[PDB]
């Protein structure tokens with residue numbers, strides 16, 4: 001369908017290890033993008049949450065002007081293997097300042113050192129911590145969960161587990177999430193080479209994160225498999241046109257909508273996976289404005 005965005009096209013055309021080296025390479029790429037398009041200044045405070053699987057470092061972002069009445073809890077992407085609070089600073093800083101929201105960015109345990117479902121547990125525990133702390137920040141105790149890619153998987157799973165875990169969640173923001181590790185979709189078949197997120201990489205991420213191949217069918221790995229989506233938190237689902245994960249994201253949004261979940265589904269045309277941590281693309285800021293607009297309607 002639609003042409004590639006021009007800046008995206010140029011980026012792809014200009015594109016060209018041990019685990020430690022690969023993690024460093026990912027961090028170096030994130031730094032370079034931040035150097036090209038610097039993040040907004042923002043007040044932050046570091047801390048550590050005691051979870052059921054150990055200490056999890058967090059960073060709380062405080063907006064210049066607080067305008068949104070729920071804390072956001074943000075889970076970074078990176079295939080469950082890469083990324084951290086610093087790689088996703090450019091996005092989180094902008095979410096904080098544009099929405100005018102307190103944001104808790106989470107440094108959950110990475111694979112393969114920690115395996116499925118450890119980060120899911122951690123992410124629930126941090127969300128619960130935030131809900132407990134919210135009144136002392138002058139906020140409502142119901143949280144908004146958010147994440148990109150693998151982080152969007154975590155946000156979606158936390159949301160599905162929330163009622164069972166007595167966790168109050170007001171909304172879920174899924175940025176090009178991974179949701180279905182079982183089924184091939186047309187986008188996954190057709191866009192899995194040459195658009196930054198590759199088939200070989202996704203297979204390797206699964207090998208690092210999952211305990212055994214059978215885990216693909218577990219709903220905490222593949223939340224799109226869950227048959228009952230009724231009563232789940234209001235959902236914003238942002239996809240990229242030329243992303244292998246596009247179709248599972250959009251299908252999940254359709255399923256949420258049909259289950260009576262208030263859902264906004266936005267495809268950014270001509271875009272690729274990862275664009276909301278790539279500030280060289282104006283669509284990153286457009287999508288952050290979509291977040292602000294969506295969250296305005298929650299209260």
Ligand SMILES: O=[N+]([O-])c1ccc(O)cc1
Pocket residue numbers: 077078079080149150178181197202203205206209
């Ligand atoms: O393991 N997986 O299926 C994944 C996980 C993350 C991602 O960005 C793509 C695929």
Ligand SMILES: O=[N+]([O-])c1ccc(O)cc1
Pocket residue numbers: 206207208210211212213
């Ligand atoms: O690490 N593992 O056990 C795996 C995980 C996923 C897969 O598709 C095959 C093997």
